[PDB]
C-alpha cells in the first residue's frame, strides 16, 4: 500500500513454463527484483537476455567462505614476514619459513574488506605507488568494525517443476511486512576507526592537510555499492553514509540501504550467469569490517 516513492523494487511476474511433458505449458508466477528484470516494448524479461546463458545454483552447495590453507610441494617453501610494521614491500627483518599459510577465508567483497586479518598496533596503509592516484590503496584495520546486515523479508521457495528432472526454485509470497534489507555500523566504532585511519593518512600526504571522504563516483552496481554475499543472497549496500566526511588537520547505528540481486555476473565474467535461489527465513549476519 503506496506511496509513489517506494518504486516497487519487487515485481510479481506471471509467465508460461515447460512442464515435465513436452506438450502442455505451465502458467506460473514468481517474484523477481527490479535489478533482475527489464521491460521491453507491462511485459518484462530477465535482464540477462542478450548477454549469456543462465544456470541456477544448486541448493545443496553453499557459498560460505571457509578457511583454506595454501601449501607448497616438496622442494619449495613459503616465507612469512613476522614484523609488526610491515607495510608490505621491501626487506623484512624477521622472516620465518612455513609449509602452509594460515586459514584465509575467500570472502568476495568490494569497498569493505570483510572477515580479514587485523593489523598490528597502528592500522596499515598499503599502496604500490602512493603518488599514483590510479593504484588502489588497501587499508587494513587493527580493531574490527562490527557490521550487522539483515534481510527483513523471510521468503518462500516455490519448487516449480521444469521436468523431466530439472526443477526451478522461484520466490513465493512474502510472509509479513514489505521491508528492505539493511546494514548497521556502530557510529562510535566507525568514528574511532576513521579518526585512527586519517592519522595514518596524514603521514604520507603532509602533516597539516585536509582529508575529505566521498562515496563512489559512478559505474556498475558492483563498484558503486558494497557488494557481498550473505546467506546465499547477494547484497549491494549504499555506502554513502560511511564515506561522507571532512577531517581537518586537528549513540546508535548507521543504517545503510541494501539491495538484493539474484542474477549475478561476478568477476566481470560473460557467458555464465548464475541465479541465486531464494533463501527461506529472515537472514541475519554479523561481520567484521577489517579493511578498505
Amino acid at each position: 500500500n503506496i506511496t509513489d516513492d517506494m518504486r516497487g523494487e519487487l515485481k510479481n511476474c506471471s509467465f508460461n513454463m515447460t512442464t515435465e511433458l513436452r506438450d502442455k505449458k505451465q502458467k506460473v508466477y514468481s517474484l523477481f527484483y527490479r535489478l533482475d528484470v527489464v521491460q521491453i516494448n507491462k511485459e518484462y524479461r530477465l535482464i540477462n537476455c542478450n548477454t549469456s546463458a543462465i544456470t541456477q545454483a544448486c541448493p545443496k552447495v553453499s557459498f560460505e567462505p571457509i578457511p583454506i590453507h595454501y601449501c607448497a610441494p616438496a622442494g619449495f617453501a613459503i616465507l612469512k614476514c613476522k614484523d609488526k610494521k610491515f607495510n608490505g614491500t621491501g626487506p623484512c627483518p624477521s622472516v620465518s619459513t612455513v609449509q602452509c599459510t594460515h586459514g584465509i577465508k575467500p570472502v568476495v567483497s568490494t569497498q569493505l574488506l570483510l572477515n580479514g586479518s587485523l593489523a598490528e598496533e597502528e592500522v596499515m596503509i598499503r599502496s604500490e605507488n602512493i603518488t599514483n592516484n590510479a593504484k588502489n590503496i588497501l587499508v587494513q584495520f587493527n580493531t574490527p568494525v562490527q557490521i550487522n546486515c539483515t534481510r527483513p523479508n523471510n521468503n518462500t521457495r516455490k519448487s516449480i517443476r521444469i521436468g523431466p528432472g530439472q526443477a526451478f526454485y522461484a520466490t513465493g509470497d512474502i510472509i509479513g511486512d514489505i521491508r528492505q534489507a539493511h546494514c548497521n555500523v556502530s557510529k562510535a566504532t566507525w568514528n574511532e576507526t576513521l579518526g585512527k585511519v586519517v592519522k595514518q593518512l596524514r603521514k604520507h600526504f603532509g602533516n597539516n592537510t585536509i582529508i575529505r571522504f566521498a562515496n563512489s563516483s559512478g559505474g556498475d552496481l558492483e563498484v558503486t555499492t558494497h557488494s557481498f554475499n550473505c546467506g546465499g543472497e547477494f547484497f549491494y549496500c549504499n555506502t554513502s553514509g560511511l564515506f561522507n566526511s571532512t577531517w581537518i588537520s586537528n549513540n546508535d547505528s548507521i543504517t545503510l540501504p541494501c539491495r538484493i540481486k539474484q542474477i549475478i555476473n561476478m568477476w566481470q565474467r560473460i557467458g555464465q550467469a548464475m541465479y541465486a535461489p531464494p533463501i527461506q527465513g529472515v537472514i541475519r549476519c554479523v561481520s567484521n569490517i577489517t579493511g578498505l
Epitope: 506511496t3 516513492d5 517506494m6 511486512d177
Partner: antibody
Framework: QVHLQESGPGLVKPSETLSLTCNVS????????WSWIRQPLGKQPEWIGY???????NYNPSLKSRVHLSLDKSKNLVSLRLTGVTAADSAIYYC??????????????????????????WGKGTSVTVSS | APTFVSVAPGQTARITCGEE??????VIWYQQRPGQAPSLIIY??????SGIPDRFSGSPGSTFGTTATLTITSVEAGDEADYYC????????????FGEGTTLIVLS
C-alpha cells in the same frame, strides 16, 4: 468539556447539494483533526473523511468526487458539502474529533510504518433523509 | 450478515470482527448503544483511553493469521450493545467502512 453539535437541513432533494455544520464548543478547530462518519439505518458506519489545517484533508475514495470538507476558524465550526446526493446518502451523520497514532513495525527510517486514526469524542449526530 | 454472542452475566464475552490478519494491525474497537452514537472503547489493539474499565481487552495486533477478538470480562447488563471494528492492516488499504458488528446479548 468537549461538546459537539451537528445540524443540517434534514430533508434534501435528489441531485442537490447537502450542507451540514458541526458546531464545536470547548476547544478550537485548528488544533485538532475532524472526521465525519455516516451510518444508514441498520448498517455499519462508513467513514466519510477527515479534515485538518495546513491542507491535510482526505476523503473517502468511494465518494471522492462528490464530498467537500472545510473548517471555519473564524466561527469555530466544521462544514460539510455533498454534491449529487441520492437515496443511499440518507443516514445519520456524526461529527467526531480524531486523534492520530503511528503503528511502527519496521525500522522507521525506511517508512516501514503507518498512521492510524481514531475518533474518541463523538457528537449527538444529525439525521439526513433524501426525498423529493 | 449480523452476528450475535450471548453471554451469561458475570462471565466472559468474546467478539470476532473483520477478516483474518495479514500483517501487523492496529484494530480500533467501537461500541454503539441502541439509539446513541458510537463510542471509542479500545484503540491500538489493546490500549484503552480514560474512562474505559480494564474489563475490555483486545487481541494483540502482532499475531499473523488470526481474527480480531474483543474480550469482555465480567459481563454486565450494561454491556448489551453493538460492537464494530476498524481494521488498520499494513497489507490492506485504508478501510473506510467498519467491520460487521456483533450484538452482545444478555444471557437467555
Amino acid at each position: 468539556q468537549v461538546h459537539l453539535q451537528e445540524s443540517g437541513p434534514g430533508l434534501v432533494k435528489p441531485s442537490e447539494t447537502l450542507s451540514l455544520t458541526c458546531n464545536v464548543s470547548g476547544t478550537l478547530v485548528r488544533d485538532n483533526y475532524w472526521s465525519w462518519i455516516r451510518q444508514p439505518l441498520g448498517k455499519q458506519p462508513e467513514w466519510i473523511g477527515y479534515v485538518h489545517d495546513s491542507g491535510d484533508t482526505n476523503y473517502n475514495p468511494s465518494l471522492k468526487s462528490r464530498v467537500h470538507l472545510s473548517l471555519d476558524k473564524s466561527k469555530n465550526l466544521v462544514s460539510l458539502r455533498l454534491t449529487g446526493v441520492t437515496a443511499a446518502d440518507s443516514a445519520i451523520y456524526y461529527c467526531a474529533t480524531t486523534k492520530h497514532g503511528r503503528r511502527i513495525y519496521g525500522v522507521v527510517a525506511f517508512k516501514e510504518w503507518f498512521t492510524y486514526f481514531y475518533m474518541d469524542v463523538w457528537g449527538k449526530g444529525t439525521s439526513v433523509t433524501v426525498s423529493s | 450478515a449480523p452476528t450475535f454472542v450471548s453471554v451469561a452475566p458475570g462471565q466472559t464475552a468474546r467478539i470476532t470482527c473483520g477478516e483474518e490478519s495479514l500483517g501487523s494491525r492496529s484494530v480500533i474497537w467501537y461500541q454503539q448503544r441502541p439509539g446513541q452514537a458510537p463510542s471509542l472503547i479500545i484503540y491500538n489493539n489493546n490500549d484503552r483511553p480514560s474512562g474505559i474499565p480494564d474489563r475490555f481487552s483486545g487481541s494483540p495486533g502482532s499475531t499473523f493469521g488470526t481474527t480480531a477478538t474483543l474480550t469482555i470480562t465480567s459481563v454486565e447488563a450494561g454491556d448489551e450493545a453493538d460492537y464494530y471494528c476498524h481494521i488498520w492492516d499494513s497489507r490492506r488499504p485504508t478501510n473506510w467502512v467498519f467491520g460487521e458488528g456483533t450484538t452482545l446479548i444478555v444471557l437467555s
